[PDB]
Amino acid sequence: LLPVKYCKMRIFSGSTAAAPEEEPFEVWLEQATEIAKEWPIPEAEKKRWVAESLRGPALDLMHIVQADNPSISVGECLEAFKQVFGSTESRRTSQVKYLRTYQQEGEKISAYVLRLETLLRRAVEKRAIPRNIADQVRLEQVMAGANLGNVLWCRLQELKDQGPLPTFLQLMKVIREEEE
Amino acid sequence: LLPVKYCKMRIFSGSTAAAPEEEPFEVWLEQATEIAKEWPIPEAEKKRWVAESLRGPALDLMHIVQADNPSISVGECLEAFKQVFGSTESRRTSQVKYLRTYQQEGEKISAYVLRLETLLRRAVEKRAIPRNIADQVRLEQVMAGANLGNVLWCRLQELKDQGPLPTFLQLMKVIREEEE
């Protein structure tokens, strides 16, 4: 009778060769846990709604897990998905992948510091960085890993010596004022 | 008459073309801090016995720092020496130098964990590692950075899993047993 504003399902596949519309697993698990815990629908239909987001190797895991136990809960299915596809990292590995992450040739500095902030949140959740030094390891990892130079280097080096170090949104406010 | 052992004074210079007898600054700073803190003799004579251990650029700094203030303490002199000659390590560079340190060229695995432990002390005095996990990052950096061997891996991983995190000496004992 009238147009209804629809919404796209977050598809996941588990391949390394992931297609452009397929999400990283952590984003899919947030959708699948909403279907598991929060939706009103019966559990036989929860399985259907989980599986209709899966394609390729991740769908093959759903078939395997159901075939071993047809009575399995959607919660225990997501425990199997966590146990297979969930991120494996640890103190040494998270610290290394964060510090080893340089700016790529196509990245603007504001995009690089946004990417880098995701890695810092990952490392803080693994308790590999104390939150009270997160600002230091931002400014220092930006200066070490970026291809930045000149008056931008000077403004960051000033802030590194300033005392009150930037929060991420303030650091971005500065870096955008240099992107212009 | 009868001969006895004759232990020579340690000399520091700050010269780039350092003579083979001249120490790296940290070793000299131990001798100077011993003269400052532990020797019984009056502070004017402490200034003299500190000065007798310096030649070239580092001696000029003793004269400069006394010329600014004839009332200065030996401790404040050593703060000026630390400022001028002490190493310029950052949290990023101490962290990276530590994590990037592998066992190399066919070193003894004991000689590797010794070389490594010197850098962990460096990083702990910067608090670039949280002191309460220094043993964790030691075990992880050994297990990542050594050639190791399987039974050693099982034993350290057992101690880490069990809970009893090694001191450096306990870790060394275990490493000798599998190194022989």
Swiss-Prot record, chains A, B:
It is found in: Nucleus, Nucleolus. Expressed in the cerebrum, cerebellum and testis. This is Paraneoplastic antigen Ma2 homolog. The gene is Pnma2. Belongs to the PNMA family.
